[PDB]
Design a protein around this ligand. Sequence first.
Ligand code: HEM
Ligand SMILES: Nc1ccc(Sc2ccc(N3C(=O)c4ccc(N)cc4C3=O)cc2)cc1
Length: 392
Amino acid sequence: SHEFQLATAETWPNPWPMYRALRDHDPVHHVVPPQRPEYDYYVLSRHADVWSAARDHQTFSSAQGLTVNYGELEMIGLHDTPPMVMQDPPVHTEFRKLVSRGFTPRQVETVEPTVRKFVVERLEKLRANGGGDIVTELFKPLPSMVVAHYLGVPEEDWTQFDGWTQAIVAANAGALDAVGSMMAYFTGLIERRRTEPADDAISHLVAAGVGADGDTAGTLSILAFTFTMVTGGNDTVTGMLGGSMPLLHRRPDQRRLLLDDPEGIPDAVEELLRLTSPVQGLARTTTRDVTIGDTTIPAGRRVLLLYGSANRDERQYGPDAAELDVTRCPRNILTFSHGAHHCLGAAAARMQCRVALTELLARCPDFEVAESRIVWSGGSYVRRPLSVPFRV
Ligand code: HEM
Ligand SMILES: Nc1ccc(Sc2ccc(N3C(=O)c4ccc(N)cc4C3=O)cc2)cc1
């Protein structure tokens, strides 16, 4: 089908034609759900519309939620202390300013050798067994360690922390024990950082004074951030890493460029981020009428920003937008959104892609994946594999 529909595990394999049908024939697409026409919403598939909408937080608010489901915030219980990705400026501004102190070049640099060691270990394990599931053995567990790092979790607690993480990530595709452990654990770690600060985002929040004094809205705000980190920082990286496998497999010319010139790997990472776009879409809510071409979207409606389509928009990337070109150097990709909410983890995600790719090519250059045997996670916003069978 080319008909608009929110993705399911069955449709994640190949949503691209439907994006194209939208972009060509109905770029400001009105969804009127037959069973609930009142919950109509709009859909944006073109690069230019998505780029400007992502930037224009005044018109396209994050404050009501990020899906197409009206009533989201209230329904899940997030009004009083929403995550930063559901705050607009000016409120979003000060918090973002404080937490950003934990997202610097030094934080991505200090974890990189840890990332490489783990990749090496799991790739050698796969190699030795002649293959296995590269998601289960590597692409799933890997991102948790990086999130743990950015949260200042002591390494000795990472295995416990990853267990909680995996339960939460699957549920958010449900996780009561894992939620409770994390909230118990971080409440304790937050208290600890009052007297033993580190360079991480939590330490920075606490050092800058958030949560002081059994109070606590501040504390819930740091806990909400921990959940933002866990729910946004894992499945996305796994979609990047796992989604890259079929793309590289089918293009031995493109692997050649990188095998002959590994310094093209940074650039190769951007192209992979472009085509995988693990956050394929997120919504905004119009705060006033807004006209894009011939469609006026009414104030108060949800708008789905198809980052995944914008990244494949032929108007921005040319008629071959659909194909891997590791030398593209794409401009203005939408993988990490654009504007106030631009992914704080962008450098961390890029690093994990760079290390994994470098070591895949160094250690498992003759590898096979069967696209038809990839199993995609459910859920309509992030596109990531649950399993990628891998033979070496
Ligand atoms: C390929 C992997 C990743 C992708 C595609 C991704 C994508 C995104 C997107 C699209 C947004 C803004 C959401 C919106 O438009 O409403 C976002 C925000 C954010 N991301 Fe990521 N992300 C990834 C990895 C990470 C990692 C590894 C971390 C932590 C180390 C991270 C931390 C954050 C944080 C804290 C925000 C909130 C920023 C704000 O709201 O001001 N992300 N990310
Ligand atoms: N890296 C990245 C990618 C995409 C997004 S969008 C996004 C939107 C909302 C959330 N999200 C929750 O659903 C949630 C539920 C309970 C909490 N206590 C915190 C959060 C949260 O951030 C997490 C992520 C956020 C971060």
